[PDB]
Design a protein around this nucleic acid. Structure first.
Ligand SMILES: [Ca+2]
Length: 579
DNA sequence: GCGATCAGCG
DNA sequence: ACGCTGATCGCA
């Protein structure tokens, strides 16, 4: 029903200097995945290509790799990484409909061309789910059906770039697309394809010792409980604690007794079993997610894991990381932190280099709220978390344990993002009256923060949305809801999203500038991971001293705020030692 | 599939 | 009754 050429060879009119390009990878994880078909729409017509012909044709390969031949795409990172696994470089992507859609409205959850097209009343393309099926029924259709679907996606991309660019421009988001998100897409593609090497011998040895300690703690739990049970069974666990042992019920879930770690910590005066259960769960978490789960995704020939950074998922502009998640590798407990010893450089005589912003959201908040005292604090490079711990526990700076600092950290963010006196009383094990008075005293010292929280909620109600420093936008329709609980959740999004999102804009800008400086200095160093406010790189040993000067400077100069940005950095033989 | 839970990020 | 995530597991 749409005219296109089912091409047998590549011809010169398919290689125009501007085109819409579809390089179709059906598998959710695109690493090393098949490319099932290619479509090209340009001023000369519409074309479908079989991958085994086009990707072995040297004029098409060169066209893909020519930066001056501009391509409009949907999810260019997926295509660029799948092509890298084919030994082919994709350059010249000048418009990415996924990232355009995500900037205009992150809550659409746009995951295919049909969903983005609908935003502009374009419906001459089908949802990917309707063409391929779902679950065990998923299949590549017959070539005529495939070709027409890939041509329709390309034709849609071709039509939609202009209306998306126009709305982006009206939102002040077009430089955000073209100068930030789209260049970041190519950097993430390199990071994902390079991967992270893993010491599988060390992991597997940790797994065996973990399995030994797991059984022991099981038996101490069975003994303390009198009997056996499925320590992960909420009904059987709930029955042991709250019926057999008759511990108080501090919290219920929609399903029944809560056994979350906060409950169990409060029950520790009552019985020794709850601490063994916490230790059991923690050991089980390391074994399931970080030992077995990671060995499951290691590519065996290279011992590399290749995460996927979702760049158009979070409602704040943060990345997320999937399969494996390399943004939530343990660090706080020493047992879990040793897993970071299995993450190693990919070449001998290379090192891991990590750098991260300290207290970035509080600095962003100081700049945006223009709170005099909070700006002064950061102009002094004070450690707000340690200072707040000193205040809470009535101790001195040397007496601040790491755990009391983690506590103060959650108080600092909690208060600015709307924790109630109840919530803070629960977290510090203090009375509710002392929690309310503490909070009022915190805003006495930072009245500009309080003004800003009130102003940003009223601005959300008037505009319908909130924005970040680089004009990322999040719509908040529940901000005028009549239900109190719905409206309250939306108000705390208005308080938090401009700050967390601005901090995500800054690290993205820093990654782009870092890559350019690394190329300007001709270093072999390259990014491996982003963890929200940290960058992880690997480089030859011989470049570490350069990176110690270059990387903190690039990150600190990514933007100019009314307070300085501060960056800490470490390097070493494994990710564990890069702290 | 979904909720509870927990790992990370602020 | 601070916010943003992803993976695992049991399933009142
Ligand atoms: Ca940090």
């Amino acid at each position: 029903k749409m005219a296109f050429t089912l091409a047998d060879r590549v011809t010169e009119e398919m290689l125009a200097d501007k085109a819409a390009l579809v390089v179709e990878v059906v598998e959710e994880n695109y690493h090393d995945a098949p490319i099932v078909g290619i479509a090209v729409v340009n001023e000369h017509g519409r074309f479908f290509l079989r991958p085994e012909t086009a990707l072995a044709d040297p004029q098409f390969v060169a066209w893909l790799g020519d930066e001056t031949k501009k391509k409009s795409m949907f999810d260019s990172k997926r295509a660029a990484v799948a092509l890298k696994w084919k030994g082919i470089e994709l350059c010249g992507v000048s418009f990415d409909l996924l990232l355009a859609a995500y900037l205009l409205d992150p809550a659409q959850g746009v995951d295919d061309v049909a969903a983005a097209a609908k935003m502009k009343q374009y419906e001459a393309v089908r949802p990917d789910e309707a063409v391929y099926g779902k679950g065990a029924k998923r299949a590549v259709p017959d070539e005529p059906v495939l070709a027409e679907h890939l041509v329709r996606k390309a034709a849609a991309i071709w039509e939609l770039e202009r209306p998306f660019l126009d709305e982006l421009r009206r939102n002040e988001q077009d430089r955000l697309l073209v100068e930030l998100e789209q260049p970041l897409s190519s950097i993430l593609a390199e990071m994902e394809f390079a991967g992270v090497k893993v010491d599988t011998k060390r992991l597997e040895q940790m797994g065996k010792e973990l399995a030994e300690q797991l059984g022991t703690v099981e038996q101490r739990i069975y003994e303390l409980a009198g009997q056996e049970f499925n320590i992960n069974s909420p009904k059987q666990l709930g029955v042991i604690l709250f019926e057999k042992l008759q511990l108080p019920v501090l919290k219920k879930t929609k399903t029944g007794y809560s056994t979350s770690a906060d409950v169990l910590e409060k029950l520790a005066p009552y019985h020794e079993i709850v601490e063994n259960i916490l230790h059991y769960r923690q050991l089980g978490k390391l074994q399931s997610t970080y030992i077995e789960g990671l060995l499951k995704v290691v590519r065996p020939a290279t011992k590399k894991v290749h995460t996927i950074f979702n760049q158009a998922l979070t409602q704040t502009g943060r990345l997320s990381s999937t399969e494996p998640n390399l943004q939530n590798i343990p660090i706080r407990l020493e047992e879990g932190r040793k897993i970071r010893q299995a993450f190693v450089p990919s070449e001998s005589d290379w090192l891991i280099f990590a750098a991260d912003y300290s207290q970035i959201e509080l600095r962003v908040l100081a700049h945006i709220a223009e709170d005099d005292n909070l700006m002064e604090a950061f102009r002094r490079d004070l450690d707000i978390h340690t200072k707040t711990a000193m205040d809470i526990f009535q101790v001195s700076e040397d007496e601040v344990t790491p755990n009391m600092r983690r506590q103060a950290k959650a108080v600092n963010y909690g208060i600015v993002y709307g924790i109630s006196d109840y919530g803070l009383a629960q977290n510090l094990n203090i009375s509710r009256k002392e929690a309310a008075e503490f909070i009022e005293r915190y805003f006495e010292s930072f009245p500009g923060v309080k003004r800003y929280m009130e102003n940003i909620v009223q601005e959300a109600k008037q505009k319908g949305y909130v924005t970040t420093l680089l004009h990322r936008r999040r719509y908040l329709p529940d901000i005028t809801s009549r239900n109190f609980n719905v409206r309250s959740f939306a108000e705390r999004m208005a308080m938090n999203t401009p700050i967390q999102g601005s901090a995500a804009d800054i690290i993205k800008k820093a990654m782009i500038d870092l890559n350019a400086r690394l190329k300007e200095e001709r270093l072999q160093a390259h990014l491996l991971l982003q963890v929200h406010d940290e960058l992880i790189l690997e480089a030859p040993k011989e470049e570490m001293e350069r990176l110690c000067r270059l990387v903190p400077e690039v990150m600190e100069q990514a933007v100019t705020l009314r307070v300085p940005l501060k960056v800490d950095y470490h390097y070493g033989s494994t990710w564990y030692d890069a702290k």
